[PDB]
Amino acid sequence: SVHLTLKKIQAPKFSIEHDFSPSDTILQIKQHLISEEKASHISEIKLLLKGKVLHDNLFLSDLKVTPANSTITVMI
Description:
- Residues 2-76 form the Ubiquitin-like domain.
- This is Ubiquitin-like protein MDY2.
- Required for efficient mating. Involved in the production of alpha-factor, the KAR9 and TUB1 location to the shmoo tip and nuclear migration into pheromone-induced shmoos.
- By secondary structure, the protein is mainly beta.
- It has a single domain, classed as Ubiquitin-like (UB roll), CATH 3.10.20.90.
- Helices cover 13% and strands 33% of the residues.
- It has one helix at residues 26-35; strands at 2-8, 14-20, 46-49, 52-53, 71-75.
- Strands 2-1-5-3-4 form a 5-stranded mixed beta sheet, covered by helices on one side.
């Protein structure tokens, strides 16, 4: 599985951890975020990794994540 940190720095801040499938897509991350009540709609959520925009149809398997680089930037 892929274990990610979902971190938003702008107030109101949060830093949450969750496991996903490499067969999950970025949408599933946005879906998880909605389910955690971090935003009113999946369309409100921008996901970033090192400044690069993670589009909805990107499979997690297409990302190389590591313990110090397993943090997705969340922008609402």
